[PDB]
């Protein structure tokens, strides 16, 4: 893989519970991809052009904790399964890929970069199958072209018997 990545955790349970309730986050933000958490689910947000983008089925209609109190979505689209919040300052905003590549790389919550073959506007197959459980918590993660620009945001795993053979994603066009 020609894009590399690594994570850094910023909080644990107590902080997370507490920051959810109050909605106030004073942590320094950094990175292209935020790891997120509410009570009942884990997922990712991808910062593109100034906005942090993730799945509706994860964030629902909720605010995001931020430095001055909770941040309201500026984009909420139930059918495309997409929501957006103004990125807090610190987030490294990526750029929408337009080149048209067909070799894509999915960035997971554990900071693997894995190869995807684009098959349609919003589908790609895994060149190597993975367990669905290894993809859990990566919804919202970016699909990337080789130049590192974003084509889409990860949404669903298409699987049989616990193994993920393909992915459904929300094309950057939508964003």
């Amino acid at each position: 893989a020609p894009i590399t990545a690594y994570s850094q955790q910023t909080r644990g349970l107590l902080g997370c519970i507490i920051t959810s309730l109050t909605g106030r986050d004073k942590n320094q933000v950094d990175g292209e991809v935020q790891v997120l958490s509410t009570a009942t689910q884990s997922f990712l947000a991808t910062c593109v052009n100034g906005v942090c983008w993730t799945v509706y089925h994860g964030a629902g209609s909720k605010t995001l904790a931020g430095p001055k109190g909770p941040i309201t979505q500026m984009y909420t689209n139930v059918d495309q399964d997409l929501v957006g919040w103004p990125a807090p300052p610190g987030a490294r905003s990526m750029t929408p890929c337009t080149c048209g590549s067909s070799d894509l790389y999915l960035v997971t919550r554990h900071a693997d970069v894995i190869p995807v073959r684009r098959r349609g506007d919003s589908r790609g197959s895994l060149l190597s199958p993975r367990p669905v459980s290894y993809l859990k918590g990566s919804s919202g993660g970016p699909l990337l072209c080789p130049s590192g620009h974003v084509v889409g945001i990860f949404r669903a795993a298409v699987c049989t018997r616990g193994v993920a053979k393909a992915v459904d994603f929300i094309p950057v066009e939508s964003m």
């Binding site: 994570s7 955790q9 997370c16 920051t19 990175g31 790891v35 997120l36 958490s37 509410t38 909770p70």
Partner: peptide, 12 residues
């Protein structure tokens, strides 16, 4: 109940 950033992935 707000969504909370619990960590981050730095890309390269």
């Amino acid at each position: 109940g707000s969504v909370v950033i619990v960590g981050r992935i730095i890309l390269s």
